[PDB]
Amino acid sequence: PQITLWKRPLVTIKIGGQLKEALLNTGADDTVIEDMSLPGRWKPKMIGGIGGFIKVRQYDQIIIEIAGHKAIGTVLVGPTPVNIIGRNLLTQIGATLNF
Amino acid sequence: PQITLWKRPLVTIKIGGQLKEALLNTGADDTVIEDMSLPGRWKPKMIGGIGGFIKVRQYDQIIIEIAGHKAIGTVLVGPTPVNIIGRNLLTQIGATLNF
Ligand SMILES: CC(C)(C)NC(=O)[C@@H]1C[C@@H]2CCCC[C@@H]2CN1C[C@@H](O)[C@H](Cc1ccccc1)NC(=O)[C@H](CC(N)=O)NC(=O)c1ccc2ccccc2n1
Numbered sequence: 001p002q003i004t005l006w007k008r009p010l011v012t013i014k015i016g017g018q019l020k021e022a023l024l025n026t027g028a029d030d031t032v033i034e035d036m037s038l039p040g041r042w043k044p045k046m047i048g049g050i051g052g053f054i055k056v057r058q059y060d061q062i063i064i065e066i067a068g069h070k071a072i073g074t075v076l077v078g079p080t081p082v083n084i085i086g087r088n089l090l091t092q093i094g095a096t097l098n099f
Numbered sequence: 100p101q102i103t104l105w106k107r108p109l110v111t112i113k114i115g116g117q118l119k120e121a122l123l124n125t126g127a128d129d130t131v132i133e134d135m136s137l138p139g140r141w142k143p144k145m146i147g148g149i150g151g152f153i154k155v156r157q158y159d160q161i162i163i164e165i166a167g168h169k170a171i172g173t174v175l176v177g178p179t180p181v182n183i184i185g186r187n188l189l190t191q192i193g194a195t196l197n198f
Contacts, residue, residue, distance in 0.1 A: 003196035005186040009125050024196055026108050027124025027183060032149070050131065050148020050179055069198070080149060084126060087104040095198040097102040097123055099168065099189075 001067075002098075013085065014065035015075070020083050022066070026097055028086030031064070032076045038062060047076060054078050069093045100166070112182065113164035114174070121165070121182035125196055129185040130163075131175045137161055144175060153177055168192035 003009045009024040016038050030047060042057040056078030063072045066085060071092035102108050108123040115137060129146060141156040155177030162171050165184055170191035 001198065003125075005125060005189050005194055005196065008128070008186075009196055023126050025124070025126030026104055026196070027122050027126050029107070048150055048180070050146065050150060051153050052148070052150025054149060067198075081147070087107070090104045090198075093198050095104060095196060097104070097108055097125070097194055098197050099100070099166075099192050099194040 011067040011085075013067070013083070015062065022083035022085050024090065024095070025084045025086050026090065026095075028084050029088065030076050030084075031073065031086045031089045032056065032078065032080045032084040034080055034083055035077055038075065038077060042077075045076060047078075054080070056080075064089060066093055110166035110184075112166075112184070114161065119182055121184050123189065123194070124183045124185060125189065125194075127183055127185035128187065129175050129183075130173065130188050131155065131177060131179045131183045131185070133179055133182055134176060137174065137176065141176075146175065146177075163188065165192055 013022045038059045042059050045058045046053045056076040060074045062075040071089050073088050109120050112121045137158045144157040155175040158174050161174040170188045
């Protein structure tokens with residue numbers, strides 16, 4: 001689809017067997033999901049942006065369904081107020097910016 | 100142009116006669132520019148990043164060129180690791196997300 005940017009580009013994702021709203025985020029390297037349980041091994045990570053850094057749990061090889069499109073990749077879980085789909089997954093979906 | 104997201108969507112901007120690089124960010128409402136001098140009066144603003152809130156200087160109706168596209172609008176100035184073009188300006192240059 002073509003998403004206009006008048007409003008937040010929010011989409012419904014599916015991850016860990018749960019439906020969620022998430023922000024399509026071209027300015028995010030990583031995909032960051034509000035704290036939840038995911039299966040498999042994880043390791044700690046520090047990620048930053050405006051306002052400094054938060055500590056998160058990194059899970060690798062995680063399937064996510066993004067607006068109906070399946071993709072697999074690393075997923076970060078932590079204290080974010082907004083679920084964020086970053087470039088690591090937006091590429092798998094073939095998302096581009098156009099103007 | 101059509102911009103894939105395998106790398107960071109960095110473009111050149113021109114603001115205050117100065118050339119800078121900035122990040123095209125669909126996940127951001129506002130545009131945040133590293134500390135620089137801009138004409139006119141400014142108003143206060145608190146914005147929330149991933150790491151928490153920072154105080155920034157809000158300048159309105161500022162002329163800014165983004166990848167050869169002219170925009171005039173609100174620019175926030177404050178500590179940021181990266182210049183960020185938010186949706187307020189992305190809509191001015193007709194940017195869309197497509198997949
Ligand atoms: C710009 C502002 C108005 C403050 N809005 C936001 O920042 C909103 C706030 C939302 C609510 C809180 C949780 C995050 C979301 C998404 N963010 C936008 C979101 O797009 C934000 C924009 C950004 C990019 C780079 C540097 C600073 C800021 N990206 C990010 O925060 C991602 C997080 C990540 N590790 O994936 N940061 C980065 O991808 C990134 C890039 C370069 C860096 C250089 C030095 C230090 C840190 C760096 N972080």
